[PDB]
């Protein structure tokens, strides 16, 4: 059995306090506690330390230490406003099974004034209370599938916890209830693996076996009776895995009401891997103002030790954070880019690293712009010239219109002359920028009651600038 420091069965601290739970063993010791990221875990050869600088009511719970090859302490953080630490807001059991509602009391002093309330009063319910575990509804009936709250008498007033929803399932006939952990496994040749196949039933008569590629394994079974149910567990421990261990593992359970099966695939690999891919082309073109999501799929073993998104791109280096992810050997990393501004064009690199090395995938994001037009009057070698500058992506074309009267837009009736410049002089064509084109119109004599409009077009839209001297 491992040894805990402090050597007490229970401990009461105030919110804000520093807590240090040290477990020491002959060999390696393993802690298993309910909250994180609250606790900072330090672990060496002989010991493991659970630590915190700021104790929260959420730190309340039982902390069990085990030596793989048991000891426990209960921590109470007595929050004067929070008497309850709710571990789960959803509890599911079968009918005639005892249901535990994980309402963790933050002050042991409060126990005798504690009551279970049904959001509010229940009907014919048999319950007991544990300061360490919460309320237990004995032999749960179908009618007891409701929303409950835990009351604590603080200063003569009732203080409720957050609702706990109880779902009591009807016990219908059928093959024994199945369990197969893990759902998936990946190991490198030479590593250790554990595959646990278990089955439960309300009746003791049932069979369970673990099959590897349709070949039944000789696993010794550990039969037990827990919470009005009989269980049979098959623990498969592989000391050092090899390509012979890989494949389909089936957990098969049967009784007089049927034969049942559940599966998992065990993959054995020669070395650590890290593969990055995208369903998207790395070259991206979107219109300014549009939203875009850049997604990378990561298949990696062992677990990633680091990952990020970096803006390499030519403009201001505002770095992502933006970045979200879903799924553990498979992960999708999504960089969200809503209502894209022009400084957000450029290169975005996704990097991931694990024991196998590092990998990166770089996206190139080019933005499309409708034309922006500017017209000015200048003199090129003594001659009067109207200069039209049009900016946009893709490259725009230019059109000049001369029309009678002063207007913002020359109309078919007022238009006197039209000049087309489909391919004007390319002034600037840098990557992740607008292309700027220039058209020059030499005007020999410019009259009064007239305006010169320059219109530019590309696939995204049109721009215009009318010049009146």
């Amino acid at each position, epitope marked *: 059995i491992p040894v805990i420091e402090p050597s007490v069965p229970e401990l009461v601290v105030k919110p804000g306090a520093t807590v240090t739970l040290r477990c020491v063993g002959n060999g390696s010791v393993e802690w298993d506690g309910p909250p994180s990221p609250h606790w900072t875990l330090y672990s060496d050869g002989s010991s493991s330390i659970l630590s915190t600088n700021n104790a929260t009511f959420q730190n309340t719970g039982t902390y069990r230490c085990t030596e793989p090859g048991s000891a426990a302490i209960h921590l109470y953080v007595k929050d004067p406003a929070r008497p309850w630490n709710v571990l789960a807001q959803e509890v599911v059991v079968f009918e005639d099974q005892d249901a535990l509602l994980p309402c963790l009391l933050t002050d042991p002093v409060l126990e005798a004034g504690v009551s279970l309330v049904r959001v509010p009063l229940m009907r014919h319910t048999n319950y007991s209370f544990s300061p360490w575990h919460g309320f237990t509804i004995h032999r749960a009936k179908f009618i007891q599938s409701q929303d409950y709250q835990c009351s604590a008498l603080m200063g003569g007033r009732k203080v409720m916890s957050i609702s706990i929803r109880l779902k009591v399932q009807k016990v219908i006939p059928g093959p024994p209830a199945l369990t197969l952990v893990p759902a998936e496994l990946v190991r490198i040749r030479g590593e250790a693996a554990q595959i646990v196949c278990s089955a439960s039933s309300v009746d003791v008569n049932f069979d369970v076996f673990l099959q590897h590629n349709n070949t039944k394994l000789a696993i010794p079974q550990q039969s037990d009776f827990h919470n009005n149910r009989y269980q049979k567990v098959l623990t498969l421990n592989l000391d050092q895995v090899d390509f012979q261990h890989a494949g389909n593992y089936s957990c098969v359970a049967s009784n007089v009401q049927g034969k049942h099966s559940t599966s998992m695939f065990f993959r054995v690999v020669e070395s650590a891997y890290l593969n990055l891919s995208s369903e998207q082309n790395l070259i991206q073109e979107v219109t300014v103002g*549009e939203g875009l999501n850049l997604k990378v799929m990561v298949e990696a073993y062992p677990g990633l030790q680091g990952f990020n998104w970096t803006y390499l791109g030519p403009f201001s280096d505002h770095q992502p954070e933006k970045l979200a992810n879903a799924t553990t050997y498979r992960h999708t990393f999504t960089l969200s880019l809503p209502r894209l501004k022009p400084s957000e064009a450029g290169r975005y690199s996704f990097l991931a690293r694990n024991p196998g090395g590092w990998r990166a995938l770089t996206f190139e994001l080019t933005l499309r712009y409708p034309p922006e037009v500017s017209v000015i009057w200048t003199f090129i070698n003594g001659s009067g010239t109207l200069l039209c500058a049009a900016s946009g992506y893709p490259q725009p074309n230019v059109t000049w219109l001369q029309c009678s009267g002063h207007t913002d*837009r020359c109309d078919e009736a007022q238009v006197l002359q039209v000049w087309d410049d489909p391919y004007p002089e390319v002034l600037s064509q840098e990557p992740f920028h607008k292309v700027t084109v220039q058209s020059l119109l030499t005007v020999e004599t410019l009259e009064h009651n007239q305006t010169y409009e320059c219109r530019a077009h590309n696939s995204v839209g049109s721009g215009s600038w009318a010049f009146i001297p």
Partner: antibody
Amino acid sequence: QVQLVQSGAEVKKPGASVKVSCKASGYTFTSYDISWVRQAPGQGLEWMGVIWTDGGTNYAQKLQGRVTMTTDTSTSTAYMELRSLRSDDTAVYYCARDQRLYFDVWGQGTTVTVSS
Amino acid sequence: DIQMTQSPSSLSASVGDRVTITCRASEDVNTYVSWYQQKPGKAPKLLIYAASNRYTGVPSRFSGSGSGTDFTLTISSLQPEDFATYYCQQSFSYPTFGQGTKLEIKR
């Protein structure tokens, strides 16, 4: 305190242009983008475009080439000009502070009537 | 453009009632959804942004939920001021609004 005050009601003939003003107070005007949203009588809200803090603009595709958004840093005033007016441009025009992911501060609106 | 479909188009409720308004986006808009309240002759007012984030000075009876394409706005206990038009807006791409939900007094 934190407000955008818009110019008064406008009446125009089809083919004319309208230039609506929007003056900021209670905050650093140059620190936030400005969007213009329009609402036709008895209808929903329609985004017209944004002017960013840098001077750049992004117009709604339906108004591209016809709308101009500008700002005056000295007077903390945003402007919106809509040309080649038609009957269906008759709406209430709002300027709003564009925080990209929401419009937190709105102007009181400017009624624009386009009729012959 | 992303279409924002509001449900219902009209709602009758009484002071004290719990009211739910739903909104569906034609494509995934993450949590870039806002809720506005508009009364006749007045400009819209921001209620919720970032799908569930309440704006400053907005009462606790107003709440938002949703991710991806389906969003909800909940008014837990209607007050006489709450009767107005409510619009959902997406800000993932070019801003677009739902057609509105008119909330009126059931009598």
